[PDB]
Amino acid sequence: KKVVKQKNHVYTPVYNELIEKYSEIPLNDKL
Amino acid sequence: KDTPFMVQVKLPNYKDYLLDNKQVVLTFKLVHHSKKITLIGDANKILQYKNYFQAN
Structure with missing residues (x-):
């Protein structure tokens, strides 16, 4: 038998976020 | 509905469709x-x- 990964059980408002932030690229590894 | 904003949207002047x-x-x-x-x-x-807006 295979499960269907039932429940995380905690709820929230969705809020696809309104106020936007500038998204700097964090590809700063060692150099 | 709790996050604060005062965002400003412009609205141009098309023919009869208004959005x-x-x-x-x-x-x-x-x-x-x-x-x-x-x-x-x-x-x-x-x-x-x-x-x-009030009617829609």
Whole structure:
């Protein structure tokens, strides 16, 4: 038998976020 | 409905359709979730925009 990964059980408002932030690229590894 | 904003949306002057299916959901999310909106422009245009938002 295979499960269907039932429940995380905690709820929230969705809020696809309104106020936007500038998204700097964090590809700063060692150099 | 609790996060604060005072976002400003411009509204151009098309023929008889008065919004855009390009830009309708983005400009209705703010009027649905806002608490005080204001309107600057022509007299009957802001009248019918108040009518349209309150009626829609």
